[PDB]
């Protein structure tokens, strides 16, 4: 019974930029899903004290997959076979992982090289109030013609397994496929490198006969930098992107999750508060559909979400 | 897995 272990608390994920990233338990952070792997139930057989360590160089997401456990199961005492929990690991991330914290730290050595992939579309910083620490981002359009980002898009999928319920990976040969990336710059030993924040996919979706409607289909910020704006810059970065096409109607979303929907309203208020069409005095006659004409136009929000935004906006005038 | 230009093909859970 030692013998059954939950898989959310049994794997842990790290990011490393640092050395010492390897033994501070606050860079640790665990899956809120591992349903598609372990079952409903969530949970691993034949081993105590099981660690599933899948630990990831900040920018390149280099990749250290070990599984460690106190004992297991021996088929001969206890008549029965421990769960292949490797095998289950190896199905969704790609090969070449190493297996050792030294042969990790040898590729953490020459992590200055790697780069964000695609164009820059946007660039901000996190400034202290109080003399402190500033953080600075940079989100980047990224496609299979930078070198190295099919390799690295496997090495990153498969925290989407870990955090949104029902993914699946997409078919990266199918050219409808737009990748947008977040980076955090950062400094060590006098050099500038880059650690991997979050990401969304786009699919650019075919409107008959000649345009289309961008749905966002997997939105990730990692863990460790969630509540802190990104998400919201993603977004946003994402609709700004697509405001330059004519041929883009708006931009929708593959089942959004309840966090997503509240997000999207942020960012789409955000956007729309200031346009003319939603001034208060407009808002105090009622919905009219330039406020969706308008938003659409300006911004490539969808006739729904600009609905949406009427009501958060009229809520936001009145008492 | 999903169908054509779908990311969230996979399966719910069923606690
Ligand atoms: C639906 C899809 O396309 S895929 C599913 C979306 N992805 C996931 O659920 C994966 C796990 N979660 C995440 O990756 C992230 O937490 C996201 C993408 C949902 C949100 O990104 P974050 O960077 O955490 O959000 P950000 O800090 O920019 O939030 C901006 C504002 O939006 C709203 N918001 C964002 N997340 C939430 C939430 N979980 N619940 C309620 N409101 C939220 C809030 O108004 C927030 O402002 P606040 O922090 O002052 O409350
Ligand atoms: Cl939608």
Same mark, same amino acid.
């Given at each position: 019974?030692?013998?059954?272990?939950?898989?959310?608390?049994?794997?842990?994920?790290?990011?490393?930029?640092?050395?010492?990233?390897?033994?501070?338990?606050?860079?640790?952070?665990?899956?809120?899903?591992?349903?598609?792997?372990?079952?409903?139930?969530?949970?691993?057989?034949?081993?105590?004290?099981?660690?599933?360590?899948?630990?990831?160089?900040?920018?390149?997401?280099?990749?250290?997959?070990?599984?460690?456990?106190?004992?297991?199961?021996?088929?001969?005492?206890?008549?029965?076979?421990?769960?292949?929990?490797?095998?289950?690991?190896?199905?969704?991330?790609?090969?070449?992982?190493?297996?050792?914290?030294?042969?990790?730290?040898?590729?953490?050595?020459?992590?200055?090289?790697?780069?964000?992939?695609?164009?820059?579309?946007?660039?901000?910083?996190?400034?202290?109030?109080?003399?402190?620490?500033?953080?600075?981002?940079?989100?980047?359009?990224?496609?299979?013609?930078?070198?190295?980002?099919?390799?690295?898009?496997?090495?990153?999928?498969?925290?989407?397994?870990?955090?949104?319920?029902?993914?699946?990976?997409?078919?990266?040969?199918?050219?409808?496929?737009?990748?947008?990336?977040?980076?955090?710059?950062?400094?060590?030993?006098?050099? +500038?490198? #880059?650690? $991997? =924040?979050?990401?969304? /996919?786009?699919?650019?979706?075919?409107?008959?006969?000649? @345009?289309? *409607?961008?749905?966002?289909?997997?939105?990730?910020?990692?863990?460790?930098?969630?509540?802190?704006?990104?998400?919201?810059?993603?977004?946003?970065?994402?609709?700004?992107?697509? +405001?330059? #096409?004519? $041929? =883009?109607?708006?931009? /929708?979303?593959?089942?959004?999750?309840?966090?997503?929907? @509240?997000? *999207?309203?942020?960012?789409?208020?955000?956007?729309?508060?200031?346009?003319?069409?939603?001034?208060?005095?407009?808002?105090?006659?009622?919905?009219?559909?330039?406020?969706?004409?308008?938003?659409?136009?300006?911004?490539?929000?969808?006739?729904?979400?600009?609905?949406?935004?009427?009501?958060?906006?009229?809520?936001?005038?009145?008492? | 897995?999903?169908?054509?230009?779908?990311?969230?093909?996979?399966?719910?859970?069923?606690?």
């Amino acid at each position: 019974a030692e013998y059954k272990c939950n898989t959310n608390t049994a794997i842990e994920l790290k990011l490393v930029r640092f050395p010492e990233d390897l033994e501070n338990d606050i860079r640790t952070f665990f899956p809120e899903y591992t349903h598609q792997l372990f079952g409903d139930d969530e949970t691993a057989f034949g081993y105590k004290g099981l660690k599933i360590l899948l630990y990831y160089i900040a920018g390149s997401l280099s990749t250290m997959f070990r599984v460690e456990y106190a004992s297991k199961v021996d088929e001969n005492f206890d008549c029965v076979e421990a769960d292949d929990v490797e095998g289950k690991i190896r199905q969704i991330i790609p090969p070449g992982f190493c297996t050792n914290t030294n042969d990790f730290l040898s590729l953490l050595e020459k992590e200055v090289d790697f780069k964000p992939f695609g164009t820059l579309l946007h660039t901000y910083s996190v400034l202290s109030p109080t003399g402190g620490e500033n953080f600075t981002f940079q989100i980047y359009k990224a496609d299979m013609t930078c070198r190295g980002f099919r390799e690295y898009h496997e090495r990153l999928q498969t925290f989407l397994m870990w955090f949104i319920e029902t993914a699946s990976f997409i078919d990266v040969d199918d050219e409808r496929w737009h990748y947008f990336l977040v980076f955090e710059k950062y400094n060590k030993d006098g050099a +500038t490198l #880059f650690a $991997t =924040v979050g990401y969304m /996919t786009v699919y650019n979706y075919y409107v008959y006969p000649d @345009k289309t *409607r961008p749905r966002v289909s997997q939105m990730l910020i990692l863990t460790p930098f969630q509540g802190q704006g990104h998400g919201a810059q993603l977004l946003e970065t994402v609709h700004r992107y697509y +405001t330059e #096409f004519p $041929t =883009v109607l708006d931009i /929708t979303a593959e089942d959004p999750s309840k966090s997503y929907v @509240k997000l *999207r309203d942020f960012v789409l208020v955000k956007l729309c508060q200031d346009l003319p069409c939603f001034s208060r005095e407009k808002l105090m006659q009622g919905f009219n559909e330039d406020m969706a004409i308008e938003a659409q136009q300006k911004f490539k929000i969808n006739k729904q979400h600009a609905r949406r935004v009427y009501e958060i906006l009229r809520l936001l005038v009145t008492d | 897995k999903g169908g054509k230009g779908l990311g969230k093909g996979g399966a719910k859970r069923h606690r």
